[PDB]
Amino acid sequence: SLRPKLSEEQQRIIAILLDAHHKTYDPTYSDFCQFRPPVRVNDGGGSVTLELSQLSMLPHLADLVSYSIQKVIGFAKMIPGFRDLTSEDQIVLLKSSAIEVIMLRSNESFTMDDMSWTCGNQDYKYRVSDVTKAGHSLELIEPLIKFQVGLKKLNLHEEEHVLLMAICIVSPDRPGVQDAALIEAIQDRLSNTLQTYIRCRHPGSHLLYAKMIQKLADLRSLNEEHSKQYRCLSFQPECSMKLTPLVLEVFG
């Protein structure tokens, strides 16, 4: 019912987050030629054995994810209040939310035109088949695509998008967090900002917030499945060389 105006602080928070995102997400994907080249081996049959023996797309996707984790770290450090947390808690939050924020932020390159993550040209267009070539199974990819479509259909304003990523990162319910109360206070400040923004820009508003919060739950499920699959992938001899030091640590 009530639609209070965004406070000066809430406006500042939003401006800071938008700026942080603009500085950490290059919509032209101009750094992609710096990643190890994508290699797409003939695997129309989706052979697990072949995929694991080759992991042809792993070096490229691992570099993309590694690069993205660095951008997420940069974004996170700019979240108002994040610097007030101990270094220990910051690392805990980053490591636990990294893959989830990557899934969220990837929605910007995701296109429902052909259900792919299109980052410029055909060389940098990723479909289900490309992810299987990196060693993952449909048990993760299909739900991920479904998640991307559901998120896409929310038609989030960029303001809502960046607040959602911030809220995802600053979650007090992450195993290993030391000061959950402080983390929850920061998250509540962000959550209240998002709730207020939605009410201000949407008459619809109550439904949208709930749908956004549900996406955060969906991400926890995707996170778990990815972790399980990463474990399996790590068993493949020489896999470490196809990954990166940051990827190894974050998911190790």
Ligand SMILES: C=C1/C(=C\C=C2/CCC[C@]3(C)[C@@H]([C@H](C)CCCC(C)(C)O)CC[C@@H]23)C[C@@H](O)[C@H](OCCCO)[C@@H]1O
């Ligand atoms: C990374 C990102 C992109 C796409 C994300 C994808 C497409 C390919 C497969 C991934 C990467 C999924 C798999 C399942 C994760 C696999 C990781 C592994 C191998 C370690 O297990 C998770 C998200 C999936 C492109 C662009 O929008 C951003 O790109 C950055 C440009 C702007 O900052 C974003 O940041």
